[PDB]
Amino acid sequence: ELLPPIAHLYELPISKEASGLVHRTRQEISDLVHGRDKRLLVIIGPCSIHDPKAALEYAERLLKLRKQYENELLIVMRVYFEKPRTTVGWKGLINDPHLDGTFDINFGLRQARSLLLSLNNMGMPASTEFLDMITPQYYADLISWGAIGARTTESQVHRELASGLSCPVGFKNGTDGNLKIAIDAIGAASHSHHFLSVTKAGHSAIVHTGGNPDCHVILRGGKEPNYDAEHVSEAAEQLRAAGVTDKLMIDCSHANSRKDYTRQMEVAQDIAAQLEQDGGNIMGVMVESHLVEGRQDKPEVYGKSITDACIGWGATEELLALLAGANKKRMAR
Amino acid sequence: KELLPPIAHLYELPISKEASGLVHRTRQEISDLVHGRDKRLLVIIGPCSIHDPKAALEYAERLLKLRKQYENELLIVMRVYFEKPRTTVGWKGLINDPHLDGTFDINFGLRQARSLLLSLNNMGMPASTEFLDMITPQYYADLISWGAIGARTTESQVHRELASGLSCPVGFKNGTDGNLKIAIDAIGAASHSHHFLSVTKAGHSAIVHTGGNPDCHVILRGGKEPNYDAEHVSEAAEQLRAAGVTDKLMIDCSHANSRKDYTRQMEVAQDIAAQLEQDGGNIMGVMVESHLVEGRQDKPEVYGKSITDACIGWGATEELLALLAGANKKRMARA
Amino acid sequence: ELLPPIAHLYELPISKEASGLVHRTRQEISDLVHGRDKRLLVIIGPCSIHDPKAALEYAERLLKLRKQYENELLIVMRVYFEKPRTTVGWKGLINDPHLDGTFDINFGLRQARSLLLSLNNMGMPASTEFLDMITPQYYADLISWGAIGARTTESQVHRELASGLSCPVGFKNGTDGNLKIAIDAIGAASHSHHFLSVTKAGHSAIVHTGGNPDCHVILRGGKEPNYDAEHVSEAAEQLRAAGVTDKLMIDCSHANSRKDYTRQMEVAQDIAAQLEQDGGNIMGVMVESHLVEGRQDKPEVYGKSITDACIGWGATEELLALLAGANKKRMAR
Amino acid sequence: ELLPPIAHLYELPISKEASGLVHRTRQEISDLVHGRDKRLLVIIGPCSIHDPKAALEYAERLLKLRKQYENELLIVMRVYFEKPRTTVGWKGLINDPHLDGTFDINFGLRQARSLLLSLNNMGMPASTEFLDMITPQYYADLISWGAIGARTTESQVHRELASGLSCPVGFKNGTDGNLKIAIDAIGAASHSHHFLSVTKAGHSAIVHTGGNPDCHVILRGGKEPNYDAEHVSEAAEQLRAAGVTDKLMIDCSHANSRKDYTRQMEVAQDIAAQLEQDGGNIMGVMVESHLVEGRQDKPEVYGKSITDACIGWGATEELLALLAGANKKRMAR
Numbered sequence A, C, D: 001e002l003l004p005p006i007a008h009l010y011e012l013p014i015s016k017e018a019s020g021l022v023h024r025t026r027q028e029i030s031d032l033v034h035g036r037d038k039r040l041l042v043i044i045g046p047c048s049i050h051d052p053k054a055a056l057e058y059a060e061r062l063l064k065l066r067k068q069y070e071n072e073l074l075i076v077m078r079v080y081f082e083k084p085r086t087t088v089g090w091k092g093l094i095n096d097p098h099l100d101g102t103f104d105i106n107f108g109l110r111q112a113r114s115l116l117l118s119l120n121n122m123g124m125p126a127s128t129e130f131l132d133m134i135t136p137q138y139y140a141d142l143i144s145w146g147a148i149g150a151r152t153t154e155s156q157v158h159r160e161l162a163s164g165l166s167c168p169v170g171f172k173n174g175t176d177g178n179l180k181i182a183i184d185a186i187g188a189a190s191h192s193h194h195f196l197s198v199t200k201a202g203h204s205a206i207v208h209t210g211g212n213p214d215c216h217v218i219l220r221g222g223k224e225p226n227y228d229a230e231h232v233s234e235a236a237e238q239l240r241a242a243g244v245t246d247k248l249m250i251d252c253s254h255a256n257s258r259k260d261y262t263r264q265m266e267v268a269q270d271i272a273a274q275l276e277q278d279g280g281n282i283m284g285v286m287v288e289s290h291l292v293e294g295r296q297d298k299p300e301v302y303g304k305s306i307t308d309a310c311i312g313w314g315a316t317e318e319l320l321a322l323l324a325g326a327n328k329k330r331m332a333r
Numbered sequence B: 001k002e003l004l005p006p007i008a009h010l011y012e013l014p015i016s017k018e019a020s021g022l023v024h025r026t027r028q029e030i031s032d033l034v035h036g037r038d039k040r041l042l043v044i045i046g047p048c049s050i051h052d053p054k055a056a057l058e059y060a061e062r063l064l065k066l067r068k069q070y071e072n073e074l075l076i077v078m079r080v081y082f083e084k085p086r087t088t089v090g091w092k093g094l095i096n097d098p099h100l101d102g103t104f105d106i107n108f109g110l111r112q113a114r115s116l117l118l119s120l121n122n123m124g125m126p127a128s129t130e131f132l133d134m135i136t137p138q139y140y141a142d143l144i145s146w147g148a149i150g151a152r153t154t155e156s157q158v159h160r161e162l163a164s165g166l167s168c169p170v171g172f173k174n175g176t177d178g179n180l181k182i183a184i185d186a187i188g189a190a191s192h193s194h195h196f197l198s199v200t201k202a203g204h205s206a207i208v209h210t211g212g213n214p215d216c217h218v219i220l221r222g223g224k225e226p227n228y229d230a231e232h233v234s235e236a237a238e239q240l241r242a243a244g245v246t247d248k249l250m251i252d253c254s255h256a257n258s259r260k261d262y263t264r265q266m267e268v269a270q271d272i273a274a275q276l277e278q279d280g281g282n283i284m285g286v287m288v289e290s291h292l293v294e295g296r297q298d299k300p301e302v303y304g305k306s307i308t309d310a311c312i313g314w315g316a317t318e319e320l321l322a323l324l325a326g327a328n329k330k331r332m333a334r335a
Ligand SMILES: C[C@@H](OP(=O)(O)O)C(=O)O
Pocket: A047, A083, A084, A129, A148, A149, A150, A151, A172, A220, A254, A308
């Protein structure tokens, strides 16, 4: 039997501090999307959250770097609770929190909210993919940035969802490399929509959104990678032709690394060189990072991904130092 | 704004014994085609979108006569699409904006969609639609004999979840650039059990556990290039078999297979007819965008003329159906 | 499965005319409760509604008398949908509309609302006993006056309900004759309350009422009748002592007639004589009247009560003429 | 915004032990109602719960006596959360838990449920008056016996409620002494009913109850006390005439003590003498008892009532010893 959002909000109401951090980070990201600030948004952290203890530890380490590089980078943790699978498989902490096929969704929603509240309380803003239609009412108040995934960017129900979110949103190119669907999606999500959604009390209702003015695209590769200067330039052209923001984000992982976590640093190096040359159209980067590198089928090892493989903490330190130094030069130019 | 729950609509428009029987029977018949147990050709045919119930009922009456006439060769089911996925923005269909004026009277739209579907089934004409929205199906799905998941949503996990709990057979379209694998993947996904959030007949969110949908198949609807010919059908059947799913598929004559030109649908149908006459063992169905009047219009001025994708008119519809019936009659007679 | 009030409001929205009639009649009745007009409120009609056809016919006849006597009497029809039984039995049209133990409550609510909308549209305002806690959301917008019954006047949940109704409300003395519980009830219902109630969407909620300033008592007999001058005078004294309105209503039926419908006219005569001597504390009277007199266990005869016995239409004409003539004299003096 | 029962059941699910205690105690009480066991049910404790700490302390003391007298008495604590007032006033812990007019009903429901869970977990079954229509879904699973108050026994909505409760229920005579309304109420509540109620998910619904076969009357005084042998005998006769159980309960407080807490022991003495002569029609007694005697308008003193005045702990020990000794003799016959 499904508890409504108000039951979770009652137990875990947003704090003054978390509320402030969310508000501020959304504004800061909006400034990047619209070219008002030349800091680099960095969406970085696990492919998926499957353990809160490891997540909190990761966050504590990330926070020290968030502060250290705050003049160059705007660091925000990946806190992904919903995973789109190719066919079937574990869909994330919300859907199956005990990792055993019990689908204890009430527990999963409580735990997702609790983790997000602790993260924001310690000073670390959070990001997630918004995949499911009804779950956002449980946690979206704690989210500073949202993704719509490659598999759902062309979906009208996701563009509707995005049009009503209060955080900035990045739309990914399609899994085969189609960018136009993401440009289209900004067009769609920036407008007003009417559609059915569920209230905080757990009731279906008609909602009328105002449109989301803070949307941008994400280059995450296709049949070929799309992270280099030539692809970025092509994309900026099309963005301008559609009359939407020509500031974009580049995912170092997924199809840009060819699913090989060791190649994320390669992509980051290319981005660093672009930032040093010019890189005027880059407002952000995405990175799949955990305490420990690689991946595992069963959750045996602490801080090691059970979905896409990630770089470990050591490489994370290097990647962030690399991007901070490069962007410091861009910002000084 | 104040959304009525499905039970309010079910109270005013409860399913009849006859409509319930027609739906049950047609779903079974279509399942038999999906699994190669019958060699009749499923034909999903009708308007791109429903925007007028009067014209829809008139179209249905004409179609019914041909449904009966060709019932040994073709299993004809009307396109009764209430939900339209747009490229960017635009009219999303009768449910979202029934008065066609930007008033978004969704309660009226749901009532009217249900009423039309009940009348169609009561006159003997089964209905099909694209299932796009997550919450609307509880209002009408009991009256639907076949569902589409669109090219733009086939790769979407929430649509595969939805499909996994529907009681009707479901066709998954290849992606707008031509990717077939996402539709094969989608059958894999939708045929399994899922747990997810959905809304009850009382209008309350709830956890649902579906049993998986065993009646799913792919639809070839074109990409950067058309994919309707024998070479593409054969390639697709191979992949289907490699994934261990049904290698019987449907071919859309419209959208990217006609290159968005309604006058080319007949071309595609002719190619399918020739395939059915040579062999065509992997074809179980075809889709066609048809209305009383051909073409399209921005405003709903002309009666029975599409306000979304352009359609063939009634005359060409008669020819197209006769062409497919004759061709499939030969297939069904062949040893 | 229970439809929420919004489903019924969607099918049967209140009209401009019915809205106006309700608003006006509530104001008019308030004027009587607070001694600003000396017309006599007359709550008259069947013990219970069991047939809408007969109800509409009765209403059409009553309307003619409502117009005729409008300078002396303010006539409002008894349209009672909810009946409190001594032990068990038929609870009214809402609970069991088909009169067969099928309890088709959705149909009953729809039919109760439809009838009330037609009555108001033809110019006849309606009254009912408010017995059930959740049903009022379905029809209260069409009610000009409400009763809380003898069996429920001492009940805190009914006093809460009354405190939030937008129509004037009469509280009946207890079945053994206790008047204090009704005086207490005005005290209670005139104040603000917080309690649980159900919304128009069918969801439980906390409500905060403002108190009902239009409440008054009804004398309906006990072990003995309480309709005479001596009892009216005693009651007015106690009313003043409790600092509440000393204008009251007298029921000609139930324990004041000793459950004998032929004695209602006796009571009405006594009231008429009071109105002619003085009768300053009387603002209303209640009468159980139908097309045909008496009662019946099965609904075999048209327009004949299946609950308490009623006077027939001929005696109804006489009773109303008697009260109109008596009050015309009161008003002139 | 009102949380639904499932939110509270999620945080405070019933335990194996509490569930067992509730189940056993209901059965044991049923056996007393139907004359299958001659132990005396004793409903004893505060007029109202306003403090959980004091309530838990009281319960710990009462538990020791519950064990000590378990062969003679079946002791169950008064854990009343809902109070019917004469006009206006504090309605109990649920309605206004902070005792300040803030009406924090969500907090009140949570706290009521938490207290009941702790009481049952320590071995002490609980009783309450069921006054409100929607609150029972939050706690009734933890209640071993329920009262319908003197002010609501004649109310059809309370008789409906009772008909669907899973615990035995006592109906009180009316505030002026009318017993027939309580006999009528057993008749009503023992039958099946259809009516509107709210589900564990907080939605209104139609419910079909099976009737409550475990109902009985409670003599709690009227204009005069009704606790003596004469009154008990008169009541048993009427009970038998109505074909319902002629085993009844006697309230030592309220109108039987003439609202004087010191007189409760007097009433208990009379009952003891009855149990020693014969007393075959007595199955229970009710007593208003707290840690400290008397009452207070403000909650200044610990363990002292803020509603009706109670006897203190010392007199409680004497009263219970008196009833145990008397009933031990009855049981031995
Ligand atoms: C879901 C995946 O992103 P994408 O949509 O680019 O495949 C991820 O970030 O883990």
